Enzyme design. Sequence first.
Site, mmCIF file in Angstrom:
data_model
loop_
_atom_site.group_PDB
_atom_site.id
_atom_site.type_symbol
_atom_site.label_atom_id
_atom_site.label_comp_id
_atom_site.label_asym_id
_atom_site.label_seq_id
_atom_site.Cartn_x
_atom_site.Cartn_y
_atom_site.Cartn_z
ATOM 1 N N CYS A 155 0.817 -1.207 0.000
ATOM 2 C CA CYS A 155 0.000 0.000 0.000
ATOM 3 C C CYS A 155 0.858 1.267 0.000
ATOM 4 C CB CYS A 155 -0.972 -0.029 1.196
ATOM 5 S SG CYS A 155 -1.616 -1.662 1.581
ATOM 6 N N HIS A 290 -2.082 7.948 6.867
ATOM 7 C CA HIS A 290 -2.415 6.705 6.179
ATOM 8 C C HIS A 290 -3.887 6.384 6.390
ATOM 9 C CE1 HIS A 290 -1.543 3.182 3.941
ATOM 10 N NE2 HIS A 290 -1.672 2.333 4.945
ATOM 11 N N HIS A 328 -9.634 3.261 0.021
ATOM 12 C CA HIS A 328 -8.244 2.832 0.127
ATOM 13 C C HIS A 328 -7.777 2.346 -1.241
ATOM 14 C CE1 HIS A 328 -4.472 1.559 1.428
ATOM 15 N NE2 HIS A 328 -4.779 0.665 2.350
HETATM 16 C C1 LIG Z 1 -1.965 -3.221 2.331
HETATM 17 C C2 LIG Z 1 -2.644 -2.703 3.557
HETATM 18 O O1 LIG Z 1 -3.576 -3.320 4.050
HETATM 19 N N1 LIG Z 1 -2.140 -1.554 4.012
HETATM 20 C C3 LIG Z 1 -2.440 -0.675 5.139
HETATM 21 C C4 LIG Z 1 -3.855 -0.915 5.640
HETATM 22 N N2 LIG Z 1 -3.678 -2.045 6.531
HETATM 23 C C5 LIG Z 1 -3.404 -2.000 7.829
HETATM 24 O O2 LIG Z 1 -3.286 -0.960 8.464
HETATM 25 C C6 LIG Z 1 -3.253 -3.349 8.486
HETATM 26 C C7 LIG Z 1 -3.021 -3.193 9.983
HETATM 27 N N3 LIG Z 1 -3.299 -4.487 10.585
HETATM 28 C C8 LIG Z 1 -4.379 -5.247 10.466
HETATM 29 O O3 LIG Z 1 -5.346 -4.925 9.798
HETATM 30 C C9 LIG Z 1 -4.323 -6.533 11.239
HETATM 31 O O4 LIG Z 1 -2.973 -6.667 11.690
HETATM 32 C C10 LIG Z 1 -4.596 -7.709 10.316
HETATM 33 C C11 LIG Z 1 -3.574 -7.505 9.217
HETATM 34 C C12 LIG Z 1 -6.013 -7.745 9.758
HETATM 35 C C13 LIG Z 1 -4.349 -9.037 11.016
HETATM 36 O O5 LIG Z 1 -4.518 -8.934 12.428
HETATM 37 P P1 LIG Z 1 -3.391 -9.621 13.343
HETATM 38 O O6 LIG Z 1 -2.069 -9.303 12.700
HETATM 39 O O7 LIG Z 1 -3.438 -8.992 14.707
#
Ligand SMILES: *CC(=O)NCCNC(=O)CCNC(=O)[C@H](O)C(C)(C)COP(*)(=O)O
Lengths: 820, 71
Positions: A155, A290, A328
């Site tokens: 991302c 973000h 997003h």
């Molecule tokens: C590519 C993408 O998704 N980029 C930024 C948006 N995502 C996040 O901020 C992910 C942050 N973490 C989570 O959503 C959780 O860590 C997960 C990945 C859904 C899994 O949970 P677990 O690791 O506790």
Amino acid sequence: ASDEPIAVIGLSCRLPKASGPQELWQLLDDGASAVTRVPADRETARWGGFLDRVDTFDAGFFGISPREAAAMDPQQRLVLELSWEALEGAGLVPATLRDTGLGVFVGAARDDYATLYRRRVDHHAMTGLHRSLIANRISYALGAHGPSMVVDTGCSSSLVAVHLACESLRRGESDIALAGGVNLNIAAESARETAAFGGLSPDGQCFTFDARANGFVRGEGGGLVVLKTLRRALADGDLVHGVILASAVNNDGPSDTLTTPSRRAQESLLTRVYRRAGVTPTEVGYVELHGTGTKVGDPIEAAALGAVLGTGRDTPLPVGSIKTNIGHLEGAAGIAGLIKALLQLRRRRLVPSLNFSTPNPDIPLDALNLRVQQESAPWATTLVAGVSSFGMGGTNCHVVVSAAPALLPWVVSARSPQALRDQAGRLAAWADSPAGREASPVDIGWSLATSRTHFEYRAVVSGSDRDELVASLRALASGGRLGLVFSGQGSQRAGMGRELYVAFPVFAEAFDEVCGVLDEVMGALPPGSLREVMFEVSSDLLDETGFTQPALFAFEVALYRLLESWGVAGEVVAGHSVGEIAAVHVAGVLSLADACALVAARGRLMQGLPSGGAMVAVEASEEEVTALLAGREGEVGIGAVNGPRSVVVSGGVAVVEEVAAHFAARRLKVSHAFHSPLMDPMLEDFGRVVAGLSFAVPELTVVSGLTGAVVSADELCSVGYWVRHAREAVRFADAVGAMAGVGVGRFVEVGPGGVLSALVRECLSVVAAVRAEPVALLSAVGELFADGYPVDWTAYFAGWPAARVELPTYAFQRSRHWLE
Amino acid sequence: DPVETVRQLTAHVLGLTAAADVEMTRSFKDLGFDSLMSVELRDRLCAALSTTLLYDHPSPAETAEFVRARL
Ligand SMILES: *CC(=O)NCCNC(=O)CCNC(=O)[C@H](O)C(C)(C)COP(*)(=O)O
């Protein structure tokens, strides 16, 4: 600042419900959400921020076959469109970046089109589906020798890309750079995978920092920024949309989970980048988060910001996220945020971050010292903003941006006549719109002249204010060597050159030099202001040959000077009767004094002849009139051979009448029978005048109305030539033929009326230059320019202090291209 | 039962075939447990009793301590 500040001089984007920066500011400032359900024509988590359509593309504009376009990633197409748009918004003419060191840095991380293709093969699929070509294709169409690469950090890609662009500029690897990214959600398999990861909001909204935060909603789009070093940008006089002071990228390192962001890494990143820019927490006016609305991520980002930019700050730091509006965009998330910040810096205003009502209980906004922007407020203190983008692999990136330190013609061009129509309509609508009314008509004409490529289908509109020019565009929406034919007697009319004098100072200056010299000559030897006789409508003095020849000479010489200042320099010249006198002068043969003496003597010596002369235009071949007049040489003869079936008989008014009656044939309003035996009495007198003038080698190729062919200097610089020219027939048709023979492909009538142009059309691109003369001459140069001639429109605006201003981009001729 | 059933479930989430292949003494993150894979234990554990149980006890054995302890 540590390193060279990088200037953002232009940008472009496609975003859900935002076709451009204008529309984007509209959506953001209204606090409108572009998130909708999945359109019917797509396939299937059931929400997202979607463009209007992704199948349309102008394949002809960029030289792409429909075959290749169909197998082409819509991401590659869109980035092409975005590149041209970004350069045009920067004010740069893409032709000029050919073979330069332009760098291209694109962030992309999704290959949905390739998935589609493979779940169902020709030689285009290789290039059309390969990711590297998203940037490389641009470099090939612009002819850029700078580095061309695609980067995938998840991302955070697009933002990293800008970073890499910045560094590449600071090292001198590239002198200009296009930086950004693209992400298009056209396949249900990627949606299913990201959905099975659990990161997706069930309500389809990004509740950034809101207690409702339950995931992100997908978005798609793309965006570009043109980047120059602040030094280079300021030197080149470009429109600065912002300045990047520093950028940095790191990774989370030892996170809890591979996908869990790290607070410490984020804090290290913030500290590094803001120390490098040398910006304290109080100088930051806003931070583009973000801001995905994830239960885990939002508290970490908020905590990092409060640690680095919250402490050591009086007022709460305003923050927000465009993912609340359009969603997003993942691979292209970063760039979007930047563009948002940029529009806030130029506008000096903030816009609401949507989907906010209650603070996340995991986010102490008060202690951390941060407040979410919910109101389209203005921006007080220059202004500095910061952008974050984080990847699920932990690669985080942050960027620090600061704010910046009579008759008019409008030119439009396009690669298709229908494209020309749409270009004109777009420009008109924009000129009427508020954004276009913040720019003056002078600045608009200037920028159209200097900041837009001149395609092969061109047009020019004239006006005095905004409304005239706008309606002109509305109406619009509904080669070879250059040859000049100078009009002769019979093309004159009352009011010659009166209105050319009032608009263009060049015509006024040349007309005053010629008229002062001619006033002197005709005051000594009168048949005392030629200006007055020509400019007066209540004046038939022009129909007498003692005034019509000097009048025509003045009108045409000043007209040639003004066409030459506008770049239009003829290569082959010719003239009907008195017309030759202008052509030979502007060829450099005769100085202004000798030419004025020649023409006034010709007119005066022809004026003192008795009446009884007449000329008739006759629809007859030269052969026919030779049959009709032979034996009457002492009384009548051929005045001119203007076409294959158009000749003027000249002679005694008696003998002219039966010729007209035999062929009945238009009687000509002339005072004497020019080019006929009745011209013998003034020949020898004329022969002495010409014997006292200085004839030089012409600077251009001259075609003789007497000979009917290219005349050499030895012939053109003899007394016998000009006396025979005053006596014998004007072979204008043969002259048009000869000019075509030497290589002329474009013919221009220098003078009033459209007579010679009709004759040239009969003989055969034919344009009658001139005949309100501000309008009547801006028309001449417009017809020249659209015919293929390179008119230096820039030099027209040297009188006004015009400046470069943003303008609408090319109206692409979009058609559908897809698979099956 | 409070032991071999953990040997037969931590593999059901990890993916190991032999039930005895579980290094039941090593940390969960060291065994390779994701967010979902950690909480899949908790969501299948009370499937046939009653949040952050497996981050509270980063070891399969030291989490398995919590069966017959308080009855
Ligand atoms: C590519 C993408 O998704 N980029 C930024 C948006 N995502 C996040 O901020 C992910 C942050 N973490 C989570 O959503 C959780 O860590 C997960 C990945 C859904 C899994 O949970 P677990 O690791 O506790």
